[PDB]
RNA sequence: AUUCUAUGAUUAGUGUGAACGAAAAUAGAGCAGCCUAUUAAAAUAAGUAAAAUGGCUUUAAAGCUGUUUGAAUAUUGUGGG
RNA sequence: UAGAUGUGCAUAGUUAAACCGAUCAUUAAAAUAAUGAAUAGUGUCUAAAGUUAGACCCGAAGCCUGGUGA
RNA sequence: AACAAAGCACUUUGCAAAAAGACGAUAAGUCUAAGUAUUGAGUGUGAUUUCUGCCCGAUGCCGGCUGGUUAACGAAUUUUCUAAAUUGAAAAAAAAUUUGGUUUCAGAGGAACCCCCGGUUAAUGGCGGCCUUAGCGUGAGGGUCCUAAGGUAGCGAAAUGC
RNA sequence: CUGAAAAUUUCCAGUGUAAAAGGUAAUCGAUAAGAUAUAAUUGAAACACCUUUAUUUUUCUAUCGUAUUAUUAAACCUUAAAUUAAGGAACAAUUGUUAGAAGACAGUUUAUGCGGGGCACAGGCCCCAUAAAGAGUAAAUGGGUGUGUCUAAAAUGUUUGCAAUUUUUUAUAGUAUAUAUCAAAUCAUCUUUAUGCUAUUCAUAGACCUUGGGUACAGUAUAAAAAUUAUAUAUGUAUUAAUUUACAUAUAUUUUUUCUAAGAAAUUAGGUAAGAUUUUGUUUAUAGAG
RNA sequence: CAGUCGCGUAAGCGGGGCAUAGGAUCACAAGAUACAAAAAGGAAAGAUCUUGGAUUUUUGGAAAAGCUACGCUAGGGAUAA
RNA sequence: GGCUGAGUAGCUCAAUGGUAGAGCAUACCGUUCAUAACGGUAUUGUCUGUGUUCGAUCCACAGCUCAGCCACCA
RNA sequence: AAUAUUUAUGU
């Protein structure tokens, strides 16, 4: 009989949060053995709305790609700076002469590939367009992939993460399971504070407040996540591995 | 009624507002008055 | 919630003197309904009022003021 | 849901830091990396097992080593595991390449550099009770003891499980008479309705 | 100290209004101080001060009060105004 | 003997009011820019008056309180 | 011709400390009554013969929901001023937070009356139309609208008739 | 919607009773088969598993409310000098507070105006006549479909043959004038100097065509631009280390601001400037047209 | 007149509409001013300026239904039969 | 200013996420030896607009109109 | 073996 306007919201006084860098000791622990790009962290941010008000549609362009679905990699000079900066950007077995053996193995991670202008001469020493044509991913001047700035090759061909308020909560994936700390939280911080702004210019009659964001992998338990990123065991610090 | 009162608050943020009526179904008023408390005309906007 | 409520009283300070059950043993301390010991305690002899100036011949202090203890059993 | 239904759920599943499978491995060990198949064909389901049950509480206490793991469809393959154990005498200086985990035979056991004189391990239709055992006394790791309110928790969930079924069979039963109920008014009844 | 008369004062102030209306202080009439009270009394004051609420008084304070509650221990800064 | 004592009004105006002051008020800073406001009081008697008291005089039906009578 | 009246009818009263009703600045208490449902009180009608029809919508009363509403109470909230402290500011400076005093806002739940359902006319009260007809009239009859129901029996230029 | 445990979600089709979304390709089976899921089919949407959420339902806890029971086991009430009695009993009763409620009772209002009063009707304001050639001027006088409104104003630049508009900057000569230059105002004119196309002519495997090169000399202007982007895909052909590259088709795009009439629409009412100055009706004529 | 904005070459024009038909105080609410601050430092409550809500329509501004043939008093014949 | 209910065909009324119906008031036909009854059919379509969903009389918002009590009532 | 709708009219 009895209805109720805003969602159900839980008192969170006893709800035991974990920072960052501990809950990820734990999350890491469960995705032991799992492939670390087929594992994908996720965020479900509780925010406190109305039933019948709008509800947000935005996307955002996170530091880091997080669809796995296009694997860009790299032919850049061999521990240059951007060799480290493909990593940055994303780039999974970018550098030099590191691929051109797998191109030789016959099985090949990544579904694009960039070959940076600098790197170009090294392309044809190989001589493994014979292979890389059949499979339609050899680059060339038509291929666009031949550029000097990689970063805005890599914003282009990814594009966005879209982002819908469901019911009473948004979710999206935030980062990969191969993410370090420091990634990681960078990558969610674009995420709160996007969805603040949208929140923030959505209206003033009745704004929506994030009440709990819980983390959780794909075969992870989804626990609360505190404010707080340094780890609470003073021993531990953080650690970065496969 | 079909004509309301509303105020211009101005956006010197002296205090001083202007008070006009106008239809509700019309956009909120924004006009360039003049404001005696700085002696210069600035922009007054409606206050709600 | 609300800055003034319904005032109330929390009973009466009382020394045990008989080790009523259910309520607490000899001596003991503690803040008892008026009716129960207007009416069955005093009249029998089981209870005391404590006044201020019993507080001083025992010797105890206002801080010593216990609490009901209905799982005591002789 | 509630804020304490998910607790009693995610606390639950926190039993990574426990009794069975649990040590902090020496400064010697830096990885390792174990290669089973995917079915239990063959004697796969010792590994298996070890890897659901004991390595992920191994991350744990000793977040610091890489623990890959490959799959291979090829059942009757090499389940071994070869155990980092040597740092090259604790020595700082870290060998560049190093594979991850993947799920078709991807990442085969990287061969040893200079300074890694490494101790294998075979586990094939063994139980991952004995695959453990050699596990720890090879590696010489230091079993952790479980803190008083560690062995408090266990003892807390342990009664949830029995009010838990106690549950389950009362709501199943209810149900059971209710859909049996239902069944046999609308097998008498409907079957009029027919006509 | 109290009491009586006048001024202060058709004032402050209250009240929609009509109207109601202080005190300090001053002048005069009297003048007296005490607890061992010039007639036999206190071991210095607790359900009291005070609060909420219903009223009186009133300027909202102070004072009076039914109901329900309910403190502190002296200028070495305790209590009232 | 000496000192003090005893309502009040006026002597300076101005403004809502204070500061200010033969100047003051308004001009969101001020400044002869304008406008408005400045010069014998006090006591007494005679008389006419305003206000409050019965208030120039006579005259209700009625209202309330305390008593009286079957 | 008005009142009363015998008769008639309705409502009320179980008496266990107060039967109801009436009186009592207001109580104890008194009358009722040294009575007990064939008693007492209240209301209308007004011996008797022959009779007392229809409507519970409105109004009043009675009964009824673990219902709705719902003052007090009250879960959850909130504010003025000021003292001290902290933070901030540390330029001519506030401001913010916690505590003390002081003073406001505030309402999930939560009574009766009321809303809602049913009952009651010797309760207060109400008790209509418009078409058509076997030939003109007259309608046994038929159709239709509306209402809670539509003035029945009887009486009828009446103390009621302009 | 106090919290916990467990469970619960049917149109048709669909394996069948699909809660919704996000992530994922494997998940379980103690060593051997198999169940599960991805695929496949249906449907708008597809499933295991792991997360956070939506609706509803039992028990438990929690908060409210109702009812009953006990009480010389000395609340209180009633009988009773008044008790180890009887009955009632945490109700009743009383006090305070709060809400409702009988003209049972109390105070007061219910006006005034009006060719007497009663009923009715009337109360501010605007225009015209009455009004007597200043102003003013009454009557329950004559006119009125009078009126407590509406309104924020809007949807290498510069035409290619040459000192040509206004104002200003700077410089030179010059003794204040003169020229050039700069910026702004007025105005979106569209700008590839030829990379395509067209014609003709050589070669050229070729039985008219394939492939690659030349040629054209332009005022009766010209083949020498009547409008020239960029891609995504598929299908070819020819090509290279290479979907490398160049063409030919189609179909989805964007680009050249360049092709679905706002100069076809909206009754916008103030300040100021400029422009227009009989707009209405009448009347003559005019396909459908009275 | 001072302040400072708009249009216009300029002169100059603009303190709403071609003119004639929309009620105050008090209280309340939103802003400003820096006057006073009941021992003192603050504040409350006040004062000045601007502004808003009125069939306050009996519109110079009361929250307001009747009977009397049981009627009463003061007047008027300033209004009747 | 705050909150709630609400209307479907000419007339009177049903249908709750899934077809948009029933009865009546005319008319045509059928049934009957014939008439009256009876039977069948026909149209006249969710107050308006917008939005959410594969899908809207149905859910959400605004308005028309009706209705509940409110706010002001200096 | 104890069933039970409705059927008026005809110078
Ligand atoms: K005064
Ligand atoms: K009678
Ligand atoms: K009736
Ligand atoms: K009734
Ligand atoms: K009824
Ligand atoms: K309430
Ligand atoms: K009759
Ligand atoms: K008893
Ligand atoms: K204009
Ligand atoms: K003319
Ligand atoms: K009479
Ligand atoms: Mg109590
Ligand atoms: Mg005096
Ligand atoms: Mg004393
Ligand atoms: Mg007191
Ligand atoms: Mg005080
Ligand atoms: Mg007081
Ligand atoms: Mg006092
Ligand atoms: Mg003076
Ligand atoms: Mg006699
Ligand atoms: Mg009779
Ligand atoms: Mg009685
Ligand atoms: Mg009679
Ligand atoms: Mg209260
Ligand atoms: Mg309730
Ligand atoms: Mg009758
Ligand atoms: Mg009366
Ligand atoms: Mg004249
Ligand atoms: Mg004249
Ligand atoms: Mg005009
Ligand atoms: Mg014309
Ligand atoms: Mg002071
Ligand atoms: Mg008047
Ligand atoms: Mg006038
Ligand atoms: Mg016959």
Known sequence: ?242 | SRIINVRLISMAMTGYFYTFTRPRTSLPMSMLKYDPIVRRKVLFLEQK | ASHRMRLQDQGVVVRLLEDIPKFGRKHAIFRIERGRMRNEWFPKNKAEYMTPARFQELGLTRDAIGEVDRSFVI | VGVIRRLNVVRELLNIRAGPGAALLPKEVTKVHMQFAHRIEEGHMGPRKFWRENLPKLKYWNPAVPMVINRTTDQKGPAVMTIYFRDDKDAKPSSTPFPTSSADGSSPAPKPAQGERIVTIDMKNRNSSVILKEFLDKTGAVAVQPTAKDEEEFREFEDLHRRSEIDRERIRKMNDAKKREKAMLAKAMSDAQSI
């Open chain 1, 1 to 242: 009989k009895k209805q109720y306007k805003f969602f159900k919201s839980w008192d969170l006084t006893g709800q035991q949060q974990f920072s960052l860098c501990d809950a990820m000791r734990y999350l890491r622990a469960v995705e032991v053995g799992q492939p670390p790009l087929s594992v994908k962290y996720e965020v479900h941010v509780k925010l406190r709305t109305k039933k019948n008000g709008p509800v947000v549609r935005d996307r955002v362009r996170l530091p880091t790609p997080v669809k796995t679905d296009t694997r860009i990699a790299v032919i850049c000079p061999e521990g240059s700076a951007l060799q480290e900066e493909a990593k940055n950007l994303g780039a999974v077995m970018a550098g030099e002469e590191t691929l051109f053996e797998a191109i030789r193995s016959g099985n090949f991670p990544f579904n694009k590939l960039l070959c940076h202008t600098e790197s170009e001469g090294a392309l044809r020493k190989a001589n493994v367009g014979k292979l890389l044509g059949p499979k339609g991913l050899m680059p060339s001047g038509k291929t666009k992939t031949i550029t000097n700035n990689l970063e805005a090759t890599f914003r282009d061909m990814i594009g966005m993460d879209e982002y819908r308020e469901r019911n009473g909560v948004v979710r999206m994936a935030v980062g990969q399971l191969g993410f370090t700390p420091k990634q990681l939280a960078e990558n969610i911080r674009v995420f709160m504070a996007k969805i603040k702004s949208d929140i923030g210019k959505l209206d003033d009659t009745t704004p929506k407040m994030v009440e709990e964001v819980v983390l959780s992998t794909t075969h992870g338990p989804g626990m609360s996540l505190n404010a707080e990123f340094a780890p609470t065991d003073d021993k531990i610090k953080p650690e970065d591995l496969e």
